[PDB]
Amino acid sequence: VVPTVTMLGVMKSRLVGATRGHALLKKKSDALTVQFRQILKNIVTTKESMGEVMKDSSFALIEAKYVAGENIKHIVLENVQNASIKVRSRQENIAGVKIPKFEYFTDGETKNDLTGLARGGQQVQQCRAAYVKAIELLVELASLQTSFLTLDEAIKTTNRRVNALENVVKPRLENTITYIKGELDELEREDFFRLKKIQGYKKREIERQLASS
Template sequence: MKGKLKGAQQGHSLLKRKSEALTKRFREITQRIDDAKRKMGRVMQVAAFSLAEVQYATGDNIAYQVQESVQKARFQVKAKQENVSGVYLPTFESHLNEEINDFKMTGLGRGGQQVQKAKMVYTRAVETLVELASLQTAFIILDEVIKVTNRRVNAIEHVIIPRTENTISYINSELDELDREEFYRLKKVQEKKQINIAAEEAEEAEKKAALEADDEDDEETEETEETEDAEDANADTPTNKDETAPASAGKKKKKNKKKKKKTATNMQPTESEVIKEVDQLASQEADVLQDNEEDVIF
């Protein structure tokens, strides 16, 4: 779209220059047409007077004599083309062949001088007429081309360029919005990751602190039990095996309690393990009940 905008701006600049050049040439042609029309009026006035003089001097049969004496065209018109800012304008040039002179003997009896004067005056009139025709043709062509060029310039300036600029601004705004959305999304993802990491670290720290606290409690209980055992051993020394048996049984019970406590604190049973234990206890109770029933039967 930026390339299209640049091309439209360049085209607008070129068409603007073309319009200015054509307008300048159009004004020049308008001035020349005005001068040519004024000149044409004066020349045709003189030509009309000279023709009246010829008719008065030679009589009414001079037109027939002129038509009969003409063999070749003495006055010729050549057409050319002129390029003005890419516009080809036709130009007409008059060419007079001096070698051809079919009116040497015309008016030999009377009025010869008036005939030669009328010939010269009408030659200038035809030259002026050819120039005026060339200017009028160029005027009409330039008028149409200038209108078309100005319409194109206005269309590019007021329609194409603003529309392209609006499209570019819309695309830029959408791209900026997408960039902002992507940045916001990445920021939220990063924040969520940081929150999850912080939560995991806090959970690990809590677990670690709980394990350390359990270990400290176990150590304290072991120390207290050891001190109690030592005090009991120092206070009462057993005399026979029957007295040592309860003491050893008490120690075993304490150790079992400590192991159970440690396993209970270190291992947290899952839901499936709890269900499994419940099933085992139920099966054991069922077995005990069955044994009791059998005993009763017997």
């Protein structure tokens, strides 16, 4: 840490860059937190729909038992008129972070139906609706987890910057300024004054010798 003005300028530039980076990181973290809050609200709505989804689904099973009695069981297993299990998900970059758009059955591609059973309509209205809810549930859960991890990392980086980087650089700048001034300027002026005194009393001695001679 040479007290030379080059190091002082370098440290000042580093502090300015640190401040700008801190501001940018704070803005990015705030935006990511807002997006995560919106995703959390959506996930809360989907969770509220959950449970009632299963309550609606149980009616389809009751209707199947009332109409067709026991299901086909084994590989067939009956009870399904729609919502073939086929999905389509893709990671999408939102707020600079890739978020998988987990679109599951009843909202995913290649979903298929085979007419309707005795309670196949009830199954479609109950079981397939649960799949549609679960598609959004999975997408929102993945997005929320990714956003939470990213926001935690960004907040950690910003807090680390504000607590260590500037809080160390500013003392470095202060120490550089103090050393530079109070050493170089003070000692240079002292040397110059001592030289001036040397010349002064040399002239005094010359005058004294001239008076003597």
